[PDB]
């Protein structure tokens, strides 16, 4: 028998086996999110325990097929991930050091606490407290008080930390044969051996910033109109021509400016579409919401939900004593097992999360034929997206007709148009220069060409010129400001979140083409259209067996990321910008600070 | 009167795995065919070569009741000409096969909370079944070309899987409980009639 006949018969054992024990652990943490219990986390921790054990040995035990004798490139495909980044290639000792670390610096974040001067006892936690300042809160010291106090004392905290932290996470991914840690990440969209259709590490970079470009002038106009905006607000806090101060951006970081919609709505007195008391008059429950939403997926050819899916899922609080943790997801369990765990309530934002996350079920139904180890999107950016986009057609005011949550009487004007256009371009496009900056600091931070001593002076040049972005208060290289985030801090690639930015509209353009959509892309609904569901459908049931190019090329007609769809969504928005500010300037000097 | 014990096969308390499939030879007794295929409590009864529609009036020297469990995808498999698993490593049904496959859910009786490791079938052979073919050897499965001498080991498996089967699963993995009736024609008594 040949090399690749025995890692077919190898990959044969470990499929059987490691959905036995997949599901063991996923069941363990099932129970655990929905009833917890110290029990339930003895159970959680013992079965993921056994779970990650056998990924090791397995792991092990694929290192010694070599890929350089297969020729099955979907066996090479499951061998290569299972051969992920070995057992800890690095030494035990190390491989020991950067868990701690890994550790430390989450439970640093998790339990970091702010305490309000003269009282040393009402002390914030991040969430809710400090959240909930950055969040509602227009008095300009307050949120400063908490932008800098949770930079001051938990930044500083993870400041050695981190240093430590990037020197063993390039030591892993150096001796896994890739240039740094940054490059290790950038393997997700990695491509070889399939001709037409390859994608190099390297390329991601090239392919983001060129994209990037483009956006820019959108992003400069929407930085234009919500500084003005903002500077009749704060008339003696922001200069008409310099950066956004970065504690007036609601949130702890200005990840998302969804939160100055108030501040910022052109039309105030046209109010937003909120179906949630058409649905309290028709005495809707949670089941009623996730039955409208299996209803669209099958309008478009879908197939239904499962029976265990009505029965195992958990759509509702338990109650008063069983306790959950209610954070909307979606559970692909195996063995033909799908559910949802959710806290639903009564209103048009759980109504749109309940057709987002039945999105992940379908994709993870459409790919269950597959392979265990290709039972995934894409890339990193493909399941998300997908979610994205249902949540779109949903909360059209054609759906919303359509349903019977909004009254036919009730017509919309351009004004209201561009109130939602903005609102959306304030989380979507406002995200898109805080992605790329965050990302290529991280980058270049493990490329090793930004100096320890210049952390800091680094993150906030690239602040006030990418992002426009200015910091209230001066940062030594004591700070670690961008550990302050959840996924510098906690180890997660964080370059997803544009691509599938970017993929979402993409899809959404495709789909709504394919649904013979009349009019701005932002008004299409692709229900009743099984042409849209088949084109989506042709790459949800690929799973990783394929190339992401070729997925993508599937669904749209494009082997890359693309960036015109994206404008194509915010054209009318960015023809109204364009005309608010003509008396206003474009663009921003990185020299004004508020602390002069 | 004699009447053929179907009961026997088709009641179990416990079936057999699909590698150690049981057979149990039914003679000399009057079998009512058309109830079990009029009791609609089936969710596949297929017959091949013969037909379920009133065909209790021919008389069968020998009948044989093959019965087992497989999950709910793997019940294809049990077919003439099929692939799978099952079929090339558990149970084959051959090209000319004459007889009915019966199978119906057992997920309230096979499955248990936290699994049910009861049943088990082949993963690996060496070679394909003949026709009514059993195989219960637990020979260690050599994959390379080191001996295995008896134990598991990197290239040797244990040729035996469980399907743990558990109550949530999906229909797909739900347990199934599968009843072969083959119809033997030889030169000989004809000993089972049934009306
Ligand atoms: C890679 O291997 C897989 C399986 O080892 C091949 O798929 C099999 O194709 C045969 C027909 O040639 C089918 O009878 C099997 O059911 C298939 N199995 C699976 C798991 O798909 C696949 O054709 C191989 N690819 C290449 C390019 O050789
Ligand atoms: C919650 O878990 C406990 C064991 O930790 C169990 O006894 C109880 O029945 C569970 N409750 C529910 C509603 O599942
Ligand atoms: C799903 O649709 C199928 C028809 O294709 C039907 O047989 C089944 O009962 C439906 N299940 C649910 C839960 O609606
Ligand atoms: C889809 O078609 C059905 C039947 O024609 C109709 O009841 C429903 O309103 C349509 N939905 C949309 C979103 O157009
Ligand atoms: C809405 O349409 C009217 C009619 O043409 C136009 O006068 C108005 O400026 C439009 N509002 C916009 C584009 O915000
Ligand atoms: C199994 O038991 C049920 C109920 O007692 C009966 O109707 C059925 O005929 C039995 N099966 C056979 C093969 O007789
Ligand atoms: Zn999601």
Redesign the pocket.
């Given at each position: 028998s040949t090399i690749e006949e025995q890692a077919k018969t190898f990959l044969d054992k470990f499929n059987h086996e490691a959905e036995d024990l997949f599901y063991q652990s996923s069941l363990a943490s099932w129970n655990y999110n929905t009833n917890i219990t110290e029990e339930n986390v003895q159970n959680m921790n013992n079965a993921g325990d056994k779970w990650s054990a056998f990924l090791k040995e397995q792991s092990t035990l694929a290192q010694m097929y070599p890929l350089q004798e297969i020729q099955n490139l979907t066996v090479k495909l499951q061998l290569q991930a299972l051969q992920q980044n070995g057992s800890s290639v690095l030494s035990e000792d190390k491989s020991k050091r950067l868990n701690t670390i890994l550790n430390t610096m989450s439970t640093i974040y998790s339990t970091g606490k702010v305490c309000n001067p003269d009282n040393p006892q009402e002390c914030l936690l991040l969430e809710p407290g400090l959240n909930e300042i950055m969040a509602n809160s227009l008095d300009y010291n307050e949120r400063l008080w908490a932008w800098e106090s949770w930079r001051s004392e938990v930044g500083k905290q993870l400041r050695p930390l981190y240093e430590e932290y990037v020197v063993l996470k390039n030591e892993m991914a150096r001796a896994n044969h890739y240039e740094d840690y940054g490059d290790y990440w950038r393997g997700d969209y990695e491509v070889n051996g399939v001709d037409g259709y390859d994608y190099s590490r390297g390329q991601l970079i090239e392919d983001v910033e060129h994209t990037f470009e483009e956006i820019k002038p959108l992003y400069e106009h929407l930085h234009a109109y919500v500084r003005a905006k903002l500077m009749n607000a704060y008339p003696s806090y922001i200069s008409p021509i310099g950066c956004l101060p970065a504690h007036l951006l609601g949130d702890m970081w200005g990840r998302f400016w969804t939160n100055l919609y108030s501040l910022t709505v052109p039309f105030g007195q046209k109010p937003n579409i909120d179906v949630t008391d058409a649905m309290v008059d028709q005495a809707w429950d949670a089941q009623r919401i996730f039955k409208e939403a299996?209803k669209f997926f099958?309008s478009v050819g879908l197939?239904?939900?499962?029976?265990g899916?009505?029965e195992n899922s958990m759509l509702t609080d338990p109650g008063n004593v069983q306790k959950a943790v209610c954070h909307p997801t979606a559970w692909d369990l195996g063995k033909g097992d799908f559910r949802i765990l959710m806290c639903t309530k009564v209103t048009m934002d759980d109504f749109l999360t309940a057709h987002h996350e039945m999105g992940h079920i379908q994709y993870d139904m459409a790919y269950a034929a597959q392979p265990f180890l290709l039972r995934n999107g894409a890339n990193e950016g493909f399941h998300e997206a997908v979610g994205e986009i249902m949540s779109l057609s949903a909360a059209t005011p054609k759906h919303l007709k359509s349903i019977g949550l909004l009254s036919p009487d009730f017509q919309e004007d351009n004004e209201t148009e561009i109130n939602f256009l903005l609102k959306q371009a304030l989380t979507i496009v406002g995200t898109l220069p805080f992605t790329y900056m965050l990302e290529k600091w991280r980058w270049m931070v493990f490329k090793g060409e930004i100096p320890k001593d210049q952390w800091m002076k680094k993150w906030w040049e690239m602040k006030r010129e990418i992002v426009g972005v200015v910091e209230p208060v001066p940062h030594d290289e004591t700070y670690c400001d961008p550990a302050s985030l959840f996924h510098v801090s906690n180890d997660y690639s964080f370059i997803r979140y544009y691509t599938r930015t970017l993929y979402q509209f993409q899809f959404q353009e495709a789909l709504c083409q394919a649904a013979k959509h009349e009019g701005p892309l932002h008004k299409c609904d692709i229900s009743n259209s099984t042409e849209a569901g088949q084109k989506l459908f042709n790459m949800l049931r690929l799973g990783k067996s394929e190339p992401w190019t070729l997925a993508l090329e599937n669904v749209v007609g494009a082997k890359n990321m693309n960036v015109r769809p994206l404008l194509n969504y915010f054209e009318p928005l960015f023809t109204w910008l364009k005309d608010q500010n003509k008396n206003s300037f474009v663009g921003w000097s990185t020299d004004w600070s508020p602390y002069a | 009167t004699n009447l053929c014990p179907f009961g026997e096969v088709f009641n179990a308390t416990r079936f057999a795995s699909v590698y150690a499939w049981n057979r149990k030879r039914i003679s000399n007794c009057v079998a009512d065919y058309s109830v079990l295929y009029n009791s609609a409590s089936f969710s596949t009864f297929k017959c091949y070569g013969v037909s379920p529609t009133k065909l209790n009036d021919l008389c069968f020297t020998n009948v044989y009741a093959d019965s087992f469990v497989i999950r709910g995808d793997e019940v294809r498999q049990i077919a003439p000409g099929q692939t799978g698993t099952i079929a090339d490593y558990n149970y084959k049904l051959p090209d000319d096969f004459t007889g009915c496959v019966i199978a119906w859910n057992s997920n309230n009786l096979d499955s248990k909370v936290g699994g049910n490791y009861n049943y088990l079938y082949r993963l690996f052979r060496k070679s394909n079944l003949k026709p009514f073919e059993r195989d219960i050897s637990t020979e260690i499965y050599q994959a390379g070309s080191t001996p295995c001498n008896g134990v598991k080991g990197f290239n040797c498996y244990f040729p035996l899987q469980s399907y743990g089967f558990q109550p949530t699963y999906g229909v797909g993995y739900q347990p199934y409980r599968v009843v072969v009736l083959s119809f033997e024609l030889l030169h000989a008594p004809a000993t089972v009639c049934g009306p």
């Open positions: 299996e099958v197939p239904n939900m499962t029976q899916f009505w | -």
